[PDB]
A = this chain, B = another copy of it.
Amino acid sequence: AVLLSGVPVLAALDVSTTQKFWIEVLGFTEEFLTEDFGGVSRDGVELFICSVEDQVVPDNTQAWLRVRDIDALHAEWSARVSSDYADASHPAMTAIREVPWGREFGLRDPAGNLVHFSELS
């Protein structure tokens, strides 16, 4: 038995809207969408999105995506996603930060999930 890859599952009270963001704003390709369960990918890296009935769940859900050329990716998204992280009514994206293992930025989606885009250095 060999493990092949891992697929983070984001949570959302509204799967469809959250998936539309990952696709149209962030530039992921749709894999599938049902009412309760959605999937997207970019460069073969997949993320699923599953419905929940309590907002505390997505507000406490995270994922990491390892990237190459984090600078290009942040620039792609800088016009599209607010840098005002303190405003919880909209998605937002942090600046790129240097952390002890590499560089990363965080992105909070419309559902509340926090995804870390990171590069090892």
Contact = CB atoms under 8 A, between A and B. Distances in A.
A4 B68 contact: yes
Contact of A64 (B9, B45, B67, B72): B9
Interface residues of A, number: 37
Copies, count: 2
A1 interface: yes
Contact of A1 (B50, B56, B63, B69): B69
Contact of A6 (B4, B11, B65): B65
B6 A72 contact: no
A2 interface: yes
Given A52-B60, A60-B52, A60-B54, A8 B8 contact: yes
Contacts of A11: 60-61
